[PDB]
Amino acid sequence: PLPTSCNPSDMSHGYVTVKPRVRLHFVELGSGPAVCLCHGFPESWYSWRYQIPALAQAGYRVLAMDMKGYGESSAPPEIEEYCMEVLCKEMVTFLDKLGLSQAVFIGHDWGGMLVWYMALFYPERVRAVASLNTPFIPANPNMSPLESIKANPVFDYQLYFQEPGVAEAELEQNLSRTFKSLFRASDESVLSMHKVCEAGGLFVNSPEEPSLSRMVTEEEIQFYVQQFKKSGFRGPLNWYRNMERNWKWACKSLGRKILIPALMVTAEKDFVLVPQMSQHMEDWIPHLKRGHIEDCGHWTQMDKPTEVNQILIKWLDSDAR
């Protein structure tokens, strides 16, 4: 039995201008402690559609964002607008304009990376932090990001995403094909993500007309299509084009721990953000709690929504509320 989902037209839609050219969109449901959900690449507030009702029914005020570059949020073209320092400071201003002293931050993928840096640099604004799939790895001030990325074969696609315009052209060519190719269970994968640079793209060796994953409906895919017609993939991809800047900012933390309540949820079949990558996070995050979802790939919220909801609500009730 799938959890209750969300109908976009039935939600409260909010807009906050954090700077003159940057307006952030979100949907809001529920009363209680504020919980801010932060999606990853290339997703939407709607990626949380199975969490938003559940969390509101559990007694939380849910704010599910369109991250900068996505949906109804602003999408400036400049790469540096999407570095973690800029993105984190904009989320602080977002809370300020909403009049929220703090919020729980829950992220997945790139949104998971942003919530860890929020917890690291703005703990006084973060009541508790949870990440789906994305670990918290301290920066190594004697290793370049180029070297780290190049040291792990599963991170090749990240090199492919570097040159502005290249991956955009591939991902924008046929939006249905893009989303139907990406949003698949681990056993339904049509992507190898091996030597994608070498092969000349993500989809060069994937079907022209992919089948629909068991995880999603045609209507759901078409919601994503419509959202990415607004701004396309430049802003989204720009999240990946700040590796050096993000490393330099992360190095300024160095020393400190994250002392707030924290939850790391691993996904057994995410073959990029692998569970093992989270090992020893407790060395830097003394109050860390864990969850683990079996039979679950990269798209955690729609792969195993019931399990996600159970994990988050149990943790929120014990550690955030």
Residue numbers in the entry: 227 to 547
Could you share sentences copied from the article?
We rationalized that replacing the cyclopropane ring and attaching a linker to the sulfonamide moiety of 3 would lead to a short branch addressing sEH-H ligand, whereas functionalization at the indole-N would result in a long branch sEH-H ligand. Based on these results, we modified 3 at both attachment points with a C3-alkyl linker bearing a terminal alkyne group and obtained short branch addressing ligand 4 and long branch addressing ligand 5. For the set of PROTACs harboring PEG linkers, we used commercially available azide-functionalized pomalidomide derivatives (20a–20f) with linker lengths varying from PEG1 to PEG6. Both sEH-H ligands 4 and 5 were treated with 20a–20f under standard CuAAC conditions to obtain the corresponding PROTACs 21a–21f and 22a–22f. To validate the postulated binding modes of short branch vs long branch addressing PROTACs, the two PEG2 exhibiting PROTACs 21b and 22b were cocrystallized with human sEH-H. As predicted, 21b addressed the exit of the short branch of the binding pocket, while 22b addresses the exit of the long branch. Right: 21b and 22b interact with asparagine 335 from the catalytic triad and tyrosine 446 and tyrosine 383. The PEG2-linkers and CRBN ligands were not resolved. All of the compounds exhibited low nanomolar potencies toward human sEH-H (hsEH-H), confirming that the attached linkers were tolerated in the active site of hsEH-H. For the murine isoform, potencies were typically less potent by 1 to 2 orders of magnitude using the short branch exit vector 18a–e and 21a–f, yet still showed strong activity. None of the PROTACs harboring an alkyne linker (18a–e and 19a–e) decreased luminescence compared to DMSO-treated cells at any concentration or incubation time. The same was observed for long branch addressing compounds with PEG1-PEG6 (22a–22f) as well as short branch addressing compounds with PEG1-PEG4 linkers (21a–21d).
Soluble epoxide hydrolase (sEH) is a ubiquitously expressed bifunctional enzyme encoded by the gene EPHX2. The protein harbors two distinct catalytic domains connected by a proline-rich linker. The bifunctional soluble epoxide hydrolase (sEH) represents a promising target for inflammation-related diseases. Proteolysis targeting chimeras (PROTACs) are heterobifunctional molecules that induce the ubiquitinylation and subsequent proteasomal degradation of a protein of interest (POI) by bringing the POI into close proximity with an E3 ligase, such as cereblon (CRBN) or the Von-Hippel-Lindau E3 ligase.
